[PDB]
Subunit: 196 residues, 3 copies
């Protein structure tokens, strides 16, 4: 519903995505409350996830998310501070939307890169940048769950395309990048399905 | 599955013992010793996230008391494996249905309590439920959150404020964070986690 | 190598694939490249390629003895590039038949007299220990959980006559070495634990 790439019938365009990654679930709930009271952003999730972090996502118009996130950071940073990472994308890539809610493993798809990040925000941030840089396709993604708060995703395409994407991923992730693997020609046995 | 019933159809088994162990192997031995020592009823014996082992038992006060004595001796053997424990002569009725699995409420203030151990969560909630006119709405023990726990209590602001003081007292340093939201947003109304 | 469910069969439906290779990696991305290298080197059958709790990656393969040996050589090189990503590994030329049905998913026995519970720091240690025990003493593998929901740890249970599970315990300790976290032996579990130890 709220994760649609383009609006459902009758809804205004809400292209912007805000993501907050918090060390405290209790803090996360209060951060969400502050965000939604400040501006009429749409809450997409408010979730404890593995490692014991709390994941908040919201969408809205650019100005709405900007405003909600300002309120979110103030609360998130209160006291000892609980903000591990954050992301604001004014215009999140259409491919990205269907991967936010739950882990996705591809059945079928080409070269591939596998990107492994220290935070959920780094994965979403770098994937968005990658998808906008080269005509690559997001195939797999796992945000936090079952991998102790890490994240990873895969992108496929022509070899040069995924190499171009890989450069942008490195730049966008910075030190949040844990590992990036490129396989120009996966064995037949791995092609299409990398996780099974 | 009815073993988590607040009241029996069967004898009354009001008291709760919980043991939180760092070793699954030790956990099994602790359970065996506890159930041999006294006729407590085992509710769960579960590996949970972070790789700890969670034991719960219920019975008469004297029974849980004796089972728990035996549990501690074994749990404390060698380098020791007991991370936390709880013994309640009487667990609040609302609490029983939240022990077995994570619960998210479908549907006026709230406090959210976040603890370092499962026992701290159960201990806190029980005390709060016994002190203030609050309602337990959400709870998650260990699973998916690296061994911590959290729960939610609702009521009037004075109610959850009263609860919160009790929660702080019982948790001690096991309390990680406690948050109060006097009027949660519509999107957060009823359901806080989704 | 990936698709069909019979691939975990103790005996073939197909030629014999008695040997087992297991790789336990700290990086999911490296794990995929390791898998690719392994299967490019020799035609081993890949059984799984799985991120698991603690955020490590689990690879298992089976094949004829020589195939698994050569795939693992290729795997070790890639896993070790730059900084090693190999947490643990196992190569068994002849994996005990009982072991095959416990690889794909956690198993809890519903019903069985004496038992040992083995708890290891790595997945490979559990599989390695279990194999040694099943070959050495007349015991039965009942429960096993590899990594998932227990932060990368593993445990398994073996049942049998009391002297038999005691002998197994000795073998498990030897094979695990420092990878052993805890081992418990219960000669007579209470009836409430008998059959089901985990619930
Ligand atoms: S990673 Fe595995 S063990 Fe750690 S919290 Fe998530 S599920 Fe539990």
């Amino acid at each position: 519903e709220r994760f649609d790439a383009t609006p459902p019938a009758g809804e205004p365009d809400r292209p912007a995505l805000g993501v907050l990654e918090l060390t405290s679930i209790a803090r996360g709930i209060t951060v969400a409350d502050a965000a939604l009271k400040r501006a009429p952003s749409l809450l997409l999730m408010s979730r404890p996830v593995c490692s014991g972090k709390h994941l908040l996502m919201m969408r809205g118009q650019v100005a709405e998310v900007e405003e909600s996130m300002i309120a979110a950071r103030e609360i998130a940073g209160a006291g000892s501070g609980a903000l591990l990472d954050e992301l604001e994308l004014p215009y999140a890539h259409e491919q990205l939307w269907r991967f936010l809610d739950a882990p996705v493993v591809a059945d079928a798809w080409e070269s591939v890169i596998i990107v492994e990040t220290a935070t959920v925000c780094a994965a979403i941030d770098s994937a968005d940048a990658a998808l906008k840089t080269a005509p690559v396709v997001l195939r797999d993604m796992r945000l936090a769950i079952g991998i102790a708060g890490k994240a990873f995703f895969t992108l496929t395409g022509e070899l040069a395309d995924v190499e171009a994407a890989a450069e942008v991923v490195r730049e966008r992730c910075g030190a949040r990048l844990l590992e990036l693997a490129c396989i120009a020609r996966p064995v037949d046995e791995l092609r299409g399905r990398l996780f099974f």
